Design a protein around this ligand. Structure first.
Ligand SMILES: CSc1ccccc1CC(=O)N1CCC[C@H](O)C1
Ligand SMILES: [Zn+2]
Length: 139
């Protein structure tokens, strides 16, 4: 689990969104596994606006932050899970790192701010949904 709190927005994995998220919806995209809802309180996270390929992510199944190298956002084939059939997921970045299903939502960040959130994984890989192209999160 986990979210990004920027301005009056909450960014979560679409497959983990709550009823309150759906009832206060701003934007969602199943191909990216992202959903954004509105918040009453202002958040403290800032979004990175860069092309970094190195950063650090939070892994809840280890209680640890790990440094990683990650690919550029791309269209990647992801195996079937309990939330989606096997399909192509867009704007996804891959790295070598530990992950488990409940690690979705952990933040990936670089020197500039939040880059994305954990969205996929398996066998020593972790995948992150990028948010750096969503410029509207800043206004
Ligand atoms: C951190 S995810 C993970 C990690 C290790 C092993 C398996 C997973 C689960 C996963 O990849 N899922 C979960 C739901 C939505 C995704 O498209 C598919
Ligand atoms: Zn950066």
């Amino acid at each position: 689990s986990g979210a990004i709190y920027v301005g009056n927005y909450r960014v979560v994995n679409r497959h983990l969104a709550t009823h309150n998220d759906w009832a206060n919806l701003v934007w969602e995209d199943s191909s990216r596994d992202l959903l954004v809802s509105s918040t009453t309180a202002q958040g403290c996270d800032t979004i990175a606006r860069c092309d970094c390929q190195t950063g650090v992510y939070y892994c809840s199944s280890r209680r640890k932050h790990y440094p990683v190298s990650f690919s550029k956002p791309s269209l990647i084939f992801v195996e079937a899970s309990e939330y989606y059939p096997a399909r192509y997921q867009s704007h996804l970045m891959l790295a070598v790192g530990h992950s488990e299903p409940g690690d979705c939502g952990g933040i990936l960040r670089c020197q500039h701010g939040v880059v994305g959130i954990v969205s996929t994984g398996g066998n020593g890989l972790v995948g992150f949904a990028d948010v750096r192209d969503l410029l509207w999160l800043d206004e």
